[PDB]
Design a protein around this ligand. Structure first.
Ligand code: FAR
Length: 167
């Protein structure tokens, strides 16, 4: 039902998850996530996996984050026995229902029944100063949808919100 063309034009965060966890028929499970700033080598965030059912994440960042040029994302995941072809993530970010950027990453070849490592390069959009001020000023109103497709079918959907106020 849901293909990449259904999400590629969205101008708002979705009101609900567009797929159920049962539709993840390929048993894809993300187990590690690490963010590196390509201009300082600084690790900006790193986690390792031990209602929303774990499909929502809250992120606490700093104001400097909104001026980064390029960020390297290291992602580790396991895969079931079904071979996976045309694995694709489409991740859209919004502040106050205004599209900031949409990232389209095609995964490399996925080895079934095994752990895989992939690297995504995030080229940040140049954000206007007024938009920078408002995202710092109103935490958690920057939101994202991450859509995962295998052979042009929605199989995973995650959500997140973001703070750029530090802690
Ligand atoms: C799976 C990854 C995430 C849930 C968050 C990582 C997203 C980014 C690093 C993009 C930041 C967007 C801007 C407009 C600055």
């Amino acid at each position: 039902p849901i293909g990449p063309e259904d999400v590629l034009g969205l101008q708002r965060i979705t009101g609900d998850y567009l797929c159920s966890p049962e539709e993840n028929i390929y048993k894809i499970d993300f187990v590690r996530f690490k963010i590196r700033d390509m201009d300082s080598g600084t690790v900006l965030f790193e986690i390792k996996k031990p209602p929303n059912a774990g499909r929502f994440v809250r992120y606490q960042f700093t104001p400097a984050f909104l001026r980064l040029r390029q960020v390297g994302a290291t992602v580790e995941f396991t895969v079931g026995d079904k071979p996976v072809n045309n694995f694709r993530m489409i991740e859209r970010h919004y502040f106050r229902n205004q599209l900031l950027k949409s990232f389209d990453f095609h995964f490399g070849f996925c080895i079934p029944s095994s752990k895989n490592t992939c690297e995504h390069i995030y080229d940040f959009p140049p954000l206007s100063e007024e938009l920078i001020s408002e995202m710092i000023r109103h935490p958690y109103e920057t939101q994202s949808d991450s859509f995962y497709f295998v052979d042009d079918r929605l199989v995973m959907h995650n959500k997140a919100d973001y703070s750029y106020s530090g802690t």
